[PDB]
Design a protein around this ligand. Structure first.
Ligand SMILES: Cc1noc(C)c1-c1ccc(=O)n(Cc2ccccc2)c1
Length: 126
């Protein structure tokens, strides 16, 4: 079995822009989630080969993880904070779609997401 190629993190044709909101997403949001004790399953793409989950990529067609998000923030992939926010939301929603409610992995995604939303409430203007 095989894993797909990861989501794009470099593309010279895509316009990029630093915003103070993006900077906050990296400095504060990502940094804080990354260190949480339930971050580890979300720090890289789901390795469905290693995990013996051969249907994962038949079910989840827009994969996303905090590894990818960290690369997209550190090498400036985004034009705005909403694109980055959508990546986080995709990662969470994928977990809730693939797994069952009350699964441990779901409880872990849920704790991250709660923290994510708290941090998003302090997103600076502009
Ligand atoms: C994240 C994620 N979403 O769906 C799956 C499957 C994973 C995932 C990623 C790495 C990963 O190691 N797992 C196994 C695991 C981790 C914590 C608790 C229970 C099971 C699962």
């Amino acid at each position: 079995s095989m894993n797909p190629p990861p989501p794009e993190t470099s593309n010279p044709n895509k316009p990029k822009r630093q915003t103070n909101q993006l900077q906050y997403l990296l400095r504060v949001v990502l940094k804080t989630l990354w260190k949480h004790q339930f971050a580890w399953p979300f720090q890289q793409p789901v390795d469905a080969v290693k995990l013996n989950l051969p249907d994962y990529y038949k079910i989840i067609k827009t994969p996303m993880d905090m590894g990818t998000i960290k690369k997209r923030l550190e090498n400036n992939y985004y034009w705005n904070a909403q694109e980055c926010i959508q990546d986080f939301n995709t990662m969470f929603t994928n977990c809730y779609i693939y797994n069952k409610p009350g699964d441990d992995i779901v409880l872990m995604a849920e704790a991250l997401e709660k923290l994510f939303l708290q941090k998003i409430n302090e997103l600076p203007t502009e």
